[PDB]
């Protein structure tokens, strides 16, 4: 019966990714004084199906100078990790209940970067190499600040279990307690998902197509799905972490609906941000994270260590 | 270096308490308030002898006292107790916080009956 | 030996160690070390060390990333080597695999001492403790106890880290 | 329209509803309709094992009440 | 000793033998050193978890810390070597004889 | 008073992030020692019953030890219930 | 390097040695070794000098391998006995890891190949620190596990160290390599008696430290790194050459100079344990060290080598910087034999 | 300028106070749960003792059954010089039993999510 | 067991997707189609040449800093100790040293990239 | 060599971690707490030379608690004899070792 649950977690996420591609185009079109896809199907509803069918019926290319084994492995790893992201998330009941869910998600997110690294290296192309090195720089920029941000925000939860976050925020949202962190966390997610203004590993204005310039058809499609699935998963994680919905043990549908609405709002927020700002330089992102976010993150970590002790409000779980 | 003595299977027989964890958690506070003496006797023996074989009789007394407690609850009022432990059982973490109304009803019944 | 899970994970651990120990392009050495780190995380998790395994896995996926960054810059070669592109790399890889296989076969079918002592087998489930108590994790409290008990360890570790930063700054000065 | 983006967002919401709702329904169905038990620590697992042993059917969710005290 | 202990010990032995043999690259030997630290971490963690030594649960973490500095130290040396020769080949480290 | 004020004004003009970080860090260092609730936090941590309280064997001269949990002797958590 | 950073690194090296020498936990001893090596690596590279980079790289590689073996020995000893204290060190295989790692840290043959290269590649002050202070921690660790040391392995390594130091010193024109090979020979002498009496090990270590401090300070005073450079000192500072010649005679082990005191007592110890062949072999082998000390004495003080014209200008200037401990080191390195019984204060 | 900082600080203070109340309540609830467990412990201890002793007794009886004619085998011989009770190894308990419950006893808690 | 099944299913789905991608469409690969892309002209060198990295020092600093989050992580569990003052002092001391390391590298121009 | 400043100053820098019988958090005991306690109390002040010989019984018990080699050998003997009896068909293991045991609380 667990296989049915795995499939029910996998297939709807892929469909939601396929239609997020449609939503992004329409959101950008209407924000740029145009319409977007509205011809293929009613209101463009059939556009994702056409795109997928065209992508998987087109020939995939094998570069002559490429290392084929790692070239093939990289998109598989990216997509598999993107799908594996979702199993510990409580909606309100996680598929896998872990005592350490935040740590698992953080480690696997760390693992996701290699797909891009090995795609850039295995393509044996100069632009792919530049994109891979930009990915290295981005990860070095963001992981430390993101980790201390999680630690500071979870000091008021008491543990790394994601199901305890619902109990922590039963009366108020976490964003009313740690809004200065949430902002930074938001920006960190934009860097972790390689999204504007931090779309540097796949920068089309400089690197033609970045790390996946040599990819085509199915492997490119899998990379694209991994990107959008990671976007949705990170927005869901932000919603659960900072916007705690109420849960009825006899009626979890209300929690599911509210959580989905918040996740959609955050995803639309990313789509809105992409159409509003220019792109950074990959050294400017590192300087922003190290010279601005790191000192504030350390100070707020000290503050959130001290505050429960000062106010006698330490969370329960040992 | 020596034969380890073990009690016979007749020595380990006892009238078991076959209620689930939900029932036990629902009745735990009154069980600890009522059956305190035999339980403390058994635990003092357990930590003093450091050997399960020495005072199985204390465990038998523990089961007998627990069974007397549950029999008293069953004879006096089981409807509030059932309505309490059903709600306790529904929760996946078996939360006391989930339903204080049934707990209040059970407390009132036990206070006015015993 | 039930489900052979710990034994299989340990075998994959040694296979990854042989993979990065044959000294191929630092890219594939890093790949093998990532594989061994992941399977070591699995091995530690199977014994109840969830935090330690995740932490080691988390630590390794970072250090390896930095190494990938350094290899692209200074360990690069016009033609990078894989385990079958060179005579000596393949020789070392095959030698490691065969040593793994022969030691496993001798220790499983027979009971032979290699260096320290011998083994019987029957799986790693026998050595367990059947401990039944607690609303906490023993590993979490042990790790958690460093601040309360290991004040001296915290002091020496923090001093070592600050000194290490200073050391890196001074070494990479050049001039 | 600007409200023509709504059909795609609605399809997204319909797709994202399925994971959590199906997980909750499967948890109720497999564990007798009462919110599958969570065992974060060894004490809770021991409680589940005791329930499974005393259930007489090898299912932990089958609960025995006061009707087992005779 | 279970088979897992022997597997971890032989992994450490393989990493040590890999370090003691140099092909051409210093980076490969640094990777072997880091593999030795990983094997030691796994072995000590298994030993501590098996015997329920609670207060020792913190020593693997400390171990990892003193891996990183060491690893960091090595990386620093490597870049200097590169800056002198343009390659990380151990052959170029031959100005000093016995 | 006249030099540090000008320096702080210039730092706030140029580096507001650093000023905020140092202010928050200094507050987090200083205030815990000047708080009356830290002792309450330590007491709450001490009051959590993680393990079984093993009873003591009666020798006959332990007036401060209760014979029953509901006896008037022993520690009281009424300070916690109104906190 | 900034002077404050230099002093911080020196204090960190000394704190690593002290943490090794005061800890009762194996993990803390390993941590002390780690921090000592971490702070030592920059000191070898105070000046850039790609030779110094090579020396630091080789030192780091050898010490990292030795630390790896150290930690594996500790872990195996923990596995076979749930103990963390520095004690009888129950397992024998873990004891062999212990001995090999500590020998590689000390530079005992056959794990001595690094010492001449590392000493030659760095400056004289760094060589002084490396050849004097870096022997304290491994010897202190060995002194506590001496009851569990296999006499065969330790004794064969000590004999090999003495032989290899004596042989390799004969081919050297560079003074730093001569000092390195002398260090190897004296490490062998110290470790040959450690299974029998640790007091003699401490005595030999103290005498060696005094002599090497005096010699390195004299080599810094007359800024010479080769034999031919030292052959010019007589035309500028004859007193330095005379003191160096007497110090070399003391190092050779000739009585009544203090360098005779350790070896003598070591022999005096080893005969009590019915060991006759080994003391004879070590005493006969030290004549190689004496020979290549006397060659330096010939080249530096007992004969006058040709000089240069520019040396005249050097006659007009003084040695501005002063070594305060140099006279005391010289006197202790030569004239302390009549005070031999004072070694009873060591135990 | 001042207004935005003021409203941010006000929201932070309100959130801190709300979380302080909620966390104190949560600590009280955790204490109550721990007390329920403590009250239930002695019964579980007694059942654990009886279950372990019964399984050891069955293991001993079968060990006698298998070991009919082994020349110098003592039935029930210990491996410790000491005569005090030693906690069973769990390899001593489920050794002569089926593999499914061996997995349940060893990996049952770890693999349950 | 459930997590291993989940990982196996995810990897199997990805592998089936790549197999469908490589075996469904018609393939016509020749020499020039599979050549590297450098905007229309032939590349001069190879992508496997050394690639200078201007943030190596920041990379080593990240290596050192990533092992302090490991130390910092068990803080939620360390907050439950009875020695709250000692734990708070040590946590603040560790964070202060991390901040001091960052400040020292900042002031020594270590955060600026190579030219 | 070993400069015992901890004993002189009464400091306890690292003696809290040397053994598993020394004040673990939450009073969690080691798996061989009793054996190590007995071995330490046997050999407290007699010295290492006398301890290695006179307290060998407690040390042997402690080590076999740590590694369980003798228990593994005994269980392996039991298993192999049972297997050889089963292969020729003379044992017929009881139902409760086949998963048919009437479970008890
Ligand atoms: C027992 C030993 C281990 C057995 C298991 C491994 C399988 C061995 C054989 C398969 C690999 C080689 C196949 C091949 O060369 O292509 C055939 C063929 C070669 O023909 P060619 O194009 O003319 O030759 C090109 C040139 O020769 C040059 O071509 P090239 O440069 O591309 O060749 C390089 C290639 C060749 O490799 C070799 O030289 C020998 C292969 C031995 C690999 C073992 C090395 C140890 C590495 C670490 C340990 C991994 C295994 C651990 C234990 C497994 C065993 C139980 O190197 C690798 O494949 C390395 C990948 C090894 C594992 C990757 C796993 C991904 C890790 C993701 C992160 C971890 C997550 C956290 C945990 O190419 C094809 O026809 C199509 C491409 C095939 C790709 C399919 C998928 C990749 C292979 C599966 C790897 C695992 C996927 C999951
Ligand atoms: C500012 O200009 C730009 C845009 O704006 C016009 C863009 O859109 C844009 C992005 C590119 C677009 C054209 C989007 C392309 C859409 C995808 C490639 C389609 C991928 C969707 C599938 C692969 C998902 C799978 C399809 C299934 C139906 C899902 C279920 C899976 C089964 C197994 C079941 C870029 C880069 C851009 O630069
Ligand atoms: C060539 C001359 C060498 C001389 C060496 C330097 C001369 C200056 C002396 C340095 C002073 C440092 C120590 C003296 C006071 C410190 C007090 C305390 O720390 O020391 C006590 C004991 O004092 C020292 O141990 C002895 C100091 C005496 C040094 C002189 C001996 C020289 C050898 C004899 C040759 C003649 C020299 C004549 C000099 C003019 C500690 O005892 P203990 O902790 O339990 O022993 C540790 C060793 N263990 C591991 C075996 C237990
Ligand atoms: C989305 C995740 C779930 C998916 C679930 C299904 C899994 C899909 C598996 C992925 C492959 C499907 C792709 C669809 C077409 C298959 C392609 C291939 O298998 O067909 C040919 C296989 O034929 C080969 O020539 C092999 C023939 C014989 C050699 C060994 C086969 C022996 C089997 C015995 C057959 C006897 C009768 C069997 C029935 C009883 C290869 O042709 P080839 O030209 O290369 O490649 C181009 C294919 N084109 C033409 C469609 C563009
Ligand atoms: C003789 C000269 C001394 C000064 C020289 C300094 C150089 C040495 C480095 C520091 C040495 C001081 C020794 C402190 C060791 C800590 C242990 C002791 O202090 O007690 C602890 C007290 O720790 C307190 O937190 C105070 C010590 C913390 C010191 C703050 C920072 C000190 C760092 C300064 C030097 C470090 C390097 C330079 C940093 C810039 C434990 O208290 P408690 O919790 O009851 O007991 C726990 C055990 N239980 C659970 C069984 C009950
Ligand atoms: C890559 C993936 C490696 C990391 C896997 C992490 C899995 C995980 O964290 O789940 C934890 C989970 C739950 O534990 P807790 O929540 O802490 O408490 C349990 C009590 N209720 O623990 C488990 O289920 C352990 C089960 C086995 C662990 C998984 C091991 C699998 C390792 C995968 C490596 C794959 C091989 C690598 C190379 C591939 C090709 C050779
Ligand atoms: C009373 C006790 C209270 C304790 C202390 C609490 C008070 C703290 C008061 C200050 C908190 C402010 C911190 C907020 C985050 C820091 C922001 C920051 O300082 O960084 C900016 C930089 O910020 C950016 O540039 C962001 C760029 C990316 C923009 C992306 C879209 C914009 C945001 C969209 C909406 C975000 C929504 C956030 C919440 C989402 C829900 C979780 C400064 O950078 P520079 O101006 O370049 O200075 C460096 C040169 N000297
Ligand atoms: C021991 C206390 C610990 C607690 C607080 C610490 C928490 C974390 C904060 C520290 C993180 C690291 C800080 C690193 C500081 C380095 C500053 C620096 O060197 O940058 C200068 C610039 O920085 C400065 O301007 C100097 C310092 C500015 C002020 C710093 C704080 C001073 C005191 C403020 C707080 C006082 C107390 C709080 C009162 C607040 C009012 C209520 C150079 O700028 P560049 O980016 O390199 O290039 C610019 C030109 N292109």
CATH of the domain at E88: 1.10.287.3510
**C-beta atoms surrounding F33 within 10 Å:** 12
Residues making up chain J, counted from first to last: 105
How far apart CA C136 and CA J47 sit, in angstroms, is: 40
The set of residues, in sequence order, having a beta carbon less than 8 Å from that of G59 and lying 6+ positions away, is G40, G41, G44, G114, G118
Q: Please list the alpha-helical segments (H only) found in chain G.
A: 3-22, 26-43, 50-80, 92-106, 114-121, 124-132, 136-144, 151-169, 175-193, 198-221, 227-230, 238-251, 260-270, 277-297, 311-314, 326-334
Question: Which residues of C lie inside 8 Å of A (Cβ-Cβ)?
Answer: 27, 31, 34, 50-51, 54-55, 57-58, 61-62, 65-66, 68-69, 72, 80, 82, 135-137, 140-141
The set of residues, in sequence order, having a beta carbon less than 8 Å from that of G75 and lying 6+ positions away, is E40, E43, E44, E47
Burial class (CB in 10 A: 0-12, 13-18, 19+), C174: exposed
Beta bridge partners of G85: G25
Burial class (CB in 10 A: 0-12, 13-18, 19+), H29: middle
G82 and E59 Cβ atoms separated by less than 8 Å: no
Beta strand residue intervals within chain C, DSSP E: none
CA distances A50 to A41, C172, G72, G225, J17, Å, are 10, 54, 60, 79, 65
Closest-CA distance, A179 to chain F, in angstroms, reads: 15
A85 and A13 Cβ atoms separated by less than 8 Å: no
Task: Map tokens 């092909």 to a residue.
Answer: E23
> Which 8-state DSSP code applies to residue G135?
G
Of the candidates B81, C7, C83, the one whose C-alpha atom is nearest the C-alpha of residue E7 is: C7
Compute, in angstroms, the gap from residue A29 CA to the centroid of ligand 2: 15
Q: Is the CB of F17 under 6 A from ligand 7?
A: yes
Long-range contacts of G175-178 (CB under 8 A, 24+ apart): G175/G219, G175/G224, G175/G225, G175/G226, G175/G227, G175/G230, G175/G296, G176/G119, G176/G120, G176/G122, G176/G124, G176/G127, G176/G225, G177/G116, G177/G119, G177/G120, G178/G292, G178/G296
How far apart CA H50 and CA H58 sit, in angstroms, is: 12
> Which 8-state DSSP code applies to residue A290?
I
Of the candidates B77, B92, G7, the one whose C-alpha atom is nearest the C-alpha of residue D24 is: B92
Determine the Cα angle at J34 with ends J33 and J40, to 5°. 90
How far apart CA H50 and CA H56 sit, in angstroms, is: 10
Burial class (CB in 10 A: 0-12, 13-18, 19+), A46: middle
How far apart CA E75 and CA E14 sit, in angstroms, is: 22
How far apart CA A227 and CA B8 sit, in angstroms, is: 65
How far apart CA C25 and CA C80 sit, in angstroms, is: 5
Per-residue buried b or exposed e for A133-147, using 16+ beta carbons within 10 Å of the residue's own CB:
bbbbbbbbbbbbbbb
Closest-CA distance, C131 to chain F, in angstroms, reads: 14
D14 and A19 Cβ atoms separated by less than 8 Å: no
Architecture per CATH, I1-108 = Up-down Bundle (1.20)
How far apart CA A159 and CA A165 sit, in angstroms, is: 9
E32 and E15 Cβ atoms separated by less than 8 Å: yes
Of the candidates C162, B58, G176, C116, the one whose C-alpha atom is nearest the C-alpha of residue I99 is: C162
Torsion angle of alpha carbons C6, C10, C15, C18, nearest 10°? Answer: 180
State residue G113 phi and psi, 5-degree precision: -55, -30
Evaluate the CA torsion angle A283, A286, A290, A291 in order and state its sign: positive
Of the candidates D27, B58, D14, I47, the one whose C-alpha atom is nearest the C-alpha of residue C76 is: I47
Rg over alpha carbons for chain A, rounded to the nearest Å, is 20
Of the candidates C122, E72, E44, G344, the one whose C-alpha atom is nearest the C-alpha of residue I60 is: E72
The set of residues, in sequence order, having a beta carbon less than 8 Å from that of G31 and lying 6+ positions away, is C153, C156, C157, C160, E62, E66, G19
Residue E97 maps to a domain: no
Please check whether residue A251 touches F, CB under 8 A: no
Determine the Cα angle at G299 with ends G297 and G305, to 5°. 140
In chain I, where are the structural domains located?
1-108
Question: Which residues of B lie inside 8 Å of A (Cβ-Cβ)?
Answer: 90-92, 98
> Which 8-state DSSP code applies to residue A289?
I
Mutation target to probe the E interface, by most E beta carbons within 10 A, among I51, I60, I61 is I60
Residue E85 maps to a domain: yes
G58 and G41 Cβ atoms separated by less than 8 Å: no
Closest-CA distance, I76 to chain H, in angstroms, reads: 14
How far apart CA A36 and CA A27 sit, in angstroms, is: 8
Q: CB F25 to CB A312 under 8 A?
A: no
In which domain, by residue range, is D15 found?
1-70
Determine the Cα angle at B30 with ends B25 and B33, to 5°. 125
3-class SS at G90?
coil
CA distances G157 to G152, G200, G296, Å, are 8, 18, 28
Please check whether residue D21 touches A, CB under 8 A: yes
State residue A68 phi and psi, 5-degree precision: -70, -40
A153 and A300 Cβ atoms separated by less than 8 Å: no
How far apart CA G135 and CA G157 sit, in angstroms, is: 16
**C-beta atoms surrounding A261 within 10 Å:** 14
Residue E33 maps to a domain: yes
State residue C170 phi and psi, 5-degree precision: -70, -40
The minimum-distance atom of ligand 7 relative to the CA of A179 is 39
3-class SS at E90?
helix
Per-residue buried b or exposed e for B32-59, using 16+ beta carbons within 10 Å of the residue's own CB:
bebbbebbbbbbbbbeeeeebeebbebb
G33 and C155 Cβ atoms separated by less than 8 Å: no
CA distances A216 to A112, A213, B110, I29, Å, are 20, 8, 73, 13
Beta bridge partners of A158: none
Closest-CA distance, I77 to chain F, in angstroms, reads: 12
How many CB pairs lie under 8 A apart between chains F and H?
22
How far apart CA A215 and CA A212 sit, in angstroms, is: 5
Q: Is the CB of I20 under 6 A from ligand 4?
A: yes
How far apart CA J50 and CA J70 sit, in angstroms, is: 26
How far apart CA A179 and CA C18 sit, in angstroms, is: 48
CATH of the domain at C30: 1.20.120.1200
Of the candidates J20, H101, C68, J99, the one whose C-alpha atom is nearest the C-alpha of residue I63 is: C68
What domain count does chain E have?
1
Determine the Cα angle at H62 with ends H57 and H63, to 5°. 95
Consecutive H or E run containing C11: helix C5-21
The set of residues, in sequence order, having a beta carbon less than 8 Å from that of C173 and lying 6+ positions away, is G1
Q: Please list the alpha-helical segments (H only) found in C75-117.
A: 87-109
Of the candidates G45, E51, A264, the one whose C-alpha atom is nearest the C-alpha of residue J21 is: E51
> Could you tell me the two tokens for J2?
């070993």
Angstrom resolution of this structure: 2.9
Please check whether residue H8 touches J, CB under 8 A: no
How far apart CA H75 and CA G33 sit, in angstroms, is: 53
Please check whether residue I113 touches C, CB under 8 A: no
Instruction: Give the side-chain half-sphere CA count within 13 A for A157.
Output: 27
How far apart CA J65 and CA J58 sit, in angstroms, is: 10
Axis-axis angle for helices H2-66, F38-47 (nearest 10): 20
Q: Is the CB of A298 under 6 A from ligand 8?
A: yes
CA distances F76 to E58, F38, F71, F72, H34, Å, are 35, 19, 11, 9, 16
Q: Please list the alpha-helical segments (H only) found in H67-90.
A: none
Of the candidates C38, J74, B35, E14, the one whose C-alpha atom is nearest the C-alpha of residue H76 is: J74
How far apart CA A52 and CA A217 sit, in angstroms, is: 9
Helix, strand, coil abundance in chain J, percent, nearest 5: 60, 0, 40
The minimum-distance atom of ligand 6 relative to the CA of C38 is 3
In which domain, by residue range, is C46 found?
5-172
Residue E44 maps to a domain: yes
CA distances B13 to E67, H49, J103, Å, are 57, 12, 13
A80 and I12 Cβ atoms separated by less than 8 Å: no
Q: Is the CB of A296 under 6 A from ligand 7?
A: yes
Spell out the SS3 assignment of J13-64. Answer: CCHHHCCCCCCCHHHCCCCCHHHHHHHHHHCCCCCHHHHHHHCHHHHHHHHH
> Which 8-state DSSP code applies to residue F65?
S
Q: Please list the alpha-helical segments (H only) found in chain I.
A: 2-23, 56-72, 75-78, 84-107
Spell out the SS3 assignment of G205-241. Answer: HHHHHHHHHHHHHHHHHCCCCEHHHHCCHHHCCHHHH
How far apart CA G185 and CA C35 sit, in angstroms, is: 46
How far apart CA G187 and CA G135 sit, in angstroms, is: 9
3-class SS at E25?
strand
The set of residues, in sequence order, having a beta carbon less than 8 Å from that of A106 and lying 6+ positions away, is A146, A147, A150, C58
Rg over alpha carbons for chain F, rounded to the nearest Å, is 25
> Could you tell me the two tokens for J66?
């740590």
Determine the Cα angle at C52 with ends C32 and C57, to 5°. 25
Number of H helices, E strands in chain A: 12, 0
Query: In whole angstroms, what separates CA G52 from the centre of its chain?
Result: 19
Torsion angle of alpha carbons G295, G300, G305, G309, nearest 10°? Answer: 150
How far apart CA F53 and CA J27 sit, in angstroms, is: 12
Please check whether residue F7 touches C, CB under 8 A: no
Of the candidates G236, G246, G223, the one whose C-alpha atom is nearest the C-alpha of residue G334 is: G246
Consecutive H or E run containing E5: helix E3-20
Query: In whole angstroms, what separates CA J85 from the centre of its chain?
Result: 32
The set of residues, in sequence order, having a beta carbon less than 8 Å from that of A76 and lying 6+ positions away, is A222, I11, I14, I15, I18
3-class SS at A251?
strand
Of J35, J78, J99, nearest to H98 by CB-CB distance is J99
The set of residues, in sequence order, having a beta carbon less than 8 Å from that of J44 and lying 6+ positions away, is none
> Which 8-state DSSP code applies to residue E89?
B
J76 and J53 Cβ atoms separated by less than 8 Å: no
**C-beta atoms surrounding B90 within 10 Å:** 18
Please check whether residue D27 touches H, CB under 8 A: no
């Amino acid at each position: 019966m667990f296989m049915i649950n795995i499939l029910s977690l996998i297939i709807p996420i892929l469909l939601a990714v396929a239609f997020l591609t449609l939503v992004e185009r329409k959101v950008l079109g209407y924000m740029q004084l145009r319409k977007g896809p509205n011809v293929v199907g009613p209101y463009g509803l059939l556009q994702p199906i056409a795109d997928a069918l065209k992508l998987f019926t087109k020939e995939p290319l094998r570069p002559a100078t490429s290392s084929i084994s790692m070239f093939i492995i990289a998109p598989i790893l990216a997509l598999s990790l993107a799908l594996t992201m979702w199993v510990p998330l409580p909606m309100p009941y996680p598929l896998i209940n872990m005592n350490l869910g935040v740590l698992f998600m953080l480690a696997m997110s760390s693992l996701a970067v290699y797909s891009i690294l090995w795609s850039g290296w295995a393509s044996n192309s100069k632009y792919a190499l530049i994109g891979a090195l930009r990915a290295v720089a981005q990860t070095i920029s963001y992981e430390v600040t993101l980790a201390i941000i999680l630690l500071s925000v979870l000091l008021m939860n008491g543990s790394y279990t994601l199901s305890t976050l619902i109990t922590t925020q039963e009366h108020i949202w976490m964003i009313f307690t740690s809004w200065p962190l949430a902002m930074m966390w938001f920006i960190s997610t934009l860097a972790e998902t390689n999204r504007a203004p931090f779309d540097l590993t796949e920068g089309e204005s400089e690197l033609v197509s970045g790390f996946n310039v040599e990819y085509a058809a199915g492997p490119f499609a899998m990379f694209f799905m991994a990107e959008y699935a990671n976007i949705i998963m990170m927005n869901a994680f932000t919603a659960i972490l900072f916007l705690g919905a109420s849960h009825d043990p006899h009626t979890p549908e209300l929690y599911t609906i509210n959580f989905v609405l918040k996740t959609l709002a955050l995803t639309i927020t990313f789509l809105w941000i992409r159409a509003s700002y220019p792109r950074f330089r990959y050294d400017q992102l590192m300087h922003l994270l190290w010279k601005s976010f790191l000192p504030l993150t350390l100070a707020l970590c000290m503050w959130h260590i001290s505050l429960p002790i000062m106010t006698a409000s330490i969370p329960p779980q040992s | 270096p020596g034969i380890v003595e073990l009690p016979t299977l007749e020595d380990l027989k006892v009238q078991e308490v076959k209620v689930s964890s939900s029932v036990l958690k629902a009745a735990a506070h009154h069980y600890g308030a009522q059956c305190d003496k035999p339980n403390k006797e058994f635990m003092l023996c357990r930590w003093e002898e450091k050997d399960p074989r020495r005072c199985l009789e204390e465990g038998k007394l523990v089961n007998q006292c627990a069974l007397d407690f549950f029999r008293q609850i069953k004879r006096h009022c089981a409807e509030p107790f059932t309505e309490y432990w059903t709600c306790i059982d529904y929760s996946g973490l078996q939360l006391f916080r989930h339903c204080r109304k049934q707990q209040a009803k059970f407390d009132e019944c036990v206070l006015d009956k015993l | 030996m039930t489900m052979y899970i710990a034994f299989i994970l340990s075998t994959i651990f040694v296979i990854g160690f042989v993979g990065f120990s044959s000294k191929p392009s630092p890219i594939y050495g890093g790949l093998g070390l990532i594989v061994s780190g992941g399977v070591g995380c699995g091995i530690v998790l199977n014994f109840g060390g969830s935090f330690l395994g995740l932490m080691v896995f988390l630590i390794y996926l970072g250090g390896m990333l930095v190494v990938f960054g350094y290899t692209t810059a200074m360990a690069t070669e016009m033609y990078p080597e894989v385990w079958v592109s060179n005579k000596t790399v393949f020789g070392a890889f095959v030698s490691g695999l065969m040593m793994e296989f022969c030691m496993v076969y001798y220790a499983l079918k027979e009971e032979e001492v290699e260096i320290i002592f011998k083994f019987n087998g029957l799986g790693d489930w026998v050595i367990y403790d059947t401990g039944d108590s607690g609303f906490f994790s023993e590993e979490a409290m042990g790790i958690a106890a460093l601040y309360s008990y290991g004040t001296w360890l915290v002091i020496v570790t923090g001093w070592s880290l600050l000194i290490g930063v200073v050391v890196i700054m001074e070494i990479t000065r050049g001039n | 329209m600007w409200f023509e983006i709504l059909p795609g967002i609605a399809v997204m919401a319909a797709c994202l509803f399925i994971p959590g709702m199906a997980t909750a329904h499967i948890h109720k169905f497999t564990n007798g309709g009462k919110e599958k038990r969570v065992a974060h620590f060894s004490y809770q697992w021991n409680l589940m094992e005791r329930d499974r042993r005393i259930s007489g059917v090898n299912r932990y969710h089958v609960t025995k009440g006061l009707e087992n005290i005779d | 000793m279970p088979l897992v202990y022997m597997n971890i010990i032989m992994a450490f032995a393989i990493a040590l033998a890999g370090l003691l043999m140099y092909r051409s690259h210093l980076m490969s030997s640094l990777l072997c050193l880091e593999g030795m630290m990983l094997s030691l971490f796994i072995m000590s963690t298994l030993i501590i978890l098996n015997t329920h030594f609670t207060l020792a649960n913190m020593m693997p973490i400390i171990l990892l810390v003193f891996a990183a500095c060491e690893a960091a130290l090595g990386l620093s040396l490597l870049v200097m070597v590169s800056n002198t020769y343009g390659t990380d080949y151990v052959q170029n480290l031959n100005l000093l004889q016995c | 008073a006249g030099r540090i004020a000008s320096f702080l004004k210039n730092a706030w003009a140029k580096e507001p992030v650093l000023v905020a970080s140092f202010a928050i860090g200094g507050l987090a260092i200083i205030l815990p020692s000047l708080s009356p609730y830290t002792n309450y936090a330590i007491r709450i941590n001490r009051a959590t019953p993680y393990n079984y309280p093993v009873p003591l064997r009666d020798d006959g001269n332990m007036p401060d030890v209760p014979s029953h949990p509901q006896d008037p002797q022993g520690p009281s958590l009424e300070w916690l219930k109104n906190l | 390097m900034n002077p404050i950073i230099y002093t911080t690194l020196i204090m960190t090296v000394m704190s690593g040695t002290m943490l090794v020498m005061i800890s009762s936990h194996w993990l803390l001893i390993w941590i002390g070794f780690e921090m000592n090596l971490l702070a030592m690596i920059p000191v070898l590279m105070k000046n850039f000098n790609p030779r110094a980079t090579e020396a630091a790289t080789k030192y780091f590689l050898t010490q990292a391998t030795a630390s790896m073996m150290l930690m594996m020995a500790i872990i195996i000893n923990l596995l076979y006995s749930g103990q963390w204290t520095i004690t009888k060190m129950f397992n024998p295989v873990a004891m062999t890891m212990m001995t090999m790692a500590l020998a590689m840290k000390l530079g005992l043959s056959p794990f001595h190949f690094w010492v001449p290269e590392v000493t030659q590649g760095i400056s004289l002050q760094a060589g002084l620190l490396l050849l004097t202070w870096q022997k304290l921690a491994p010897l202190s660790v060995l002194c506590q596990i001496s009851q569990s040391i296999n006499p065969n392995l330790m004794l064969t390594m000590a004999m090999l160290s003495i032989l290899i130091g004596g042989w390799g010193g004969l081919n050297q024109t560079q003074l730093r390599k001569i000092m390195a090979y002398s260090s190897i020979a004296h490490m062998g002498w110290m470790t040959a008696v450690l299974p029998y009496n640790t007091t003699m090990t401490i005595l030999n270590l103290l005498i060696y430290i005094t002599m090497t401090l005096a010699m390195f300070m004299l080599l810094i005073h007359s800024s010479a790194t080769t034999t031919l450079s030292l052959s010019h000192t007589w035309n500028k500072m004859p007193v330095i050459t005379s003191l160096m010649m007497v110090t070399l005679l003391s190092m050779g082990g000739l009585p009544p100079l203090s360098g005779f005191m350790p070896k003598w007592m070591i022999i005096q110890e080893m005969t009590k344990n019915e060991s006759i062949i080994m003391p004879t072999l070590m005493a006969m082998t030290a004549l190689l060290n004496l020979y290549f000390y006397m060659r330096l004495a010939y080249s530096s003080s007992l004969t006058m080598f040709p000089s240069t014209n520019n040396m005249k200008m050097k006659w007009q200037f003084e040695h501005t910087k002063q070594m305060k401990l140099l006279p005391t080191m010289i006197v202790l390195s030569t004239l302390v034999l009549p005070m031999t019984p004072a070694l009873s204060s060591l135990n | 300028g001042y207004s935005m900082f003021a409203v941010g600080i006000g929201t932070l203070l309100f959130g801190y106070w709300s979380m302080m109340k909620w966390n104190r309540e949560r600590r009280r609830l955790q204490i109550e749960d721990f007390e329920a467990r403590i009250a239930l412990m002695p019964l579980f201890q007694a059942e654990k003792d009886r279950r372990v002793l019964q399984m050891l007794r069955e293991n001993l009886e079968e060990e006698a059954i298998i070991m009919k004619d082994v020349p110098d085998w003592k039935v029930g011989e210990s491996v410790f010089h000491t005569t005090r009770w030693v906690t069973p190894m769990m390899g001593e308990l489920y050794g002569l039993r089926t593999n499914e419950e061996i997995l349940s006893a060893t990996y049952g808690f770890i693999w349950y999510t | 067991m459930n997590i291993m099944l989940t990982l196996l299913t995810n990897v199997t789905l990805a592998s089936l997707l790549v197999l469908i991608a490589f075996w469904l469409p018609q393939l016509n690969a020749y020499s020039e189609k599979t050549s590297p892309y450098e905007c229309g002209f032939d590349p001069m060198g190879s992508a496997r040449l050394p690639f200078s990295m201007k943030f190596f020092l920041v990379a080593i600093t990240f290596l050192l800093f990533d092992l302090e989050i490991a130390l910092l992580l068990p803080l939620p569990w360390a907050s439950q100790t009875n020695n709250l003052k000692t734990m708070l002092t040590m946590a603040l001391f560790l964070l202060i040293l991390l901040a001091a390391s960052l400040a020292y590298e900042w002031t020594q121009k270590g955060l600026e990239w190579a030219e | 060599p070993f400069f015992d400043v901890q004993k002189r100053l009464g400091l306890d820098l690292d003696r809290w971690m040397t053994i598993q019988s020394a004040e673990q958090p939450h009073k969690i005991p080691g798996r061989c707490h009793a054996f190590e306690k007995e071995w330490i109390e046997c050999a407290h002040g007699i010295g290492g030379i006398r301890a290695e010989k006179e307290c060998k019984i407690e040390f042997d018990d402690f080590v076999e608690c740590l590694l369980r080699q003798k228990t593994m050998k005994r269980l392996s003997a039991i298993k192999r004899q049972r297997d050889k009896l089963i292969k020729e068909g003379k044992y017929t293991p009881p139902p409760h070792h086949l998963g048919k045991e009437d479970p008890r609380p």
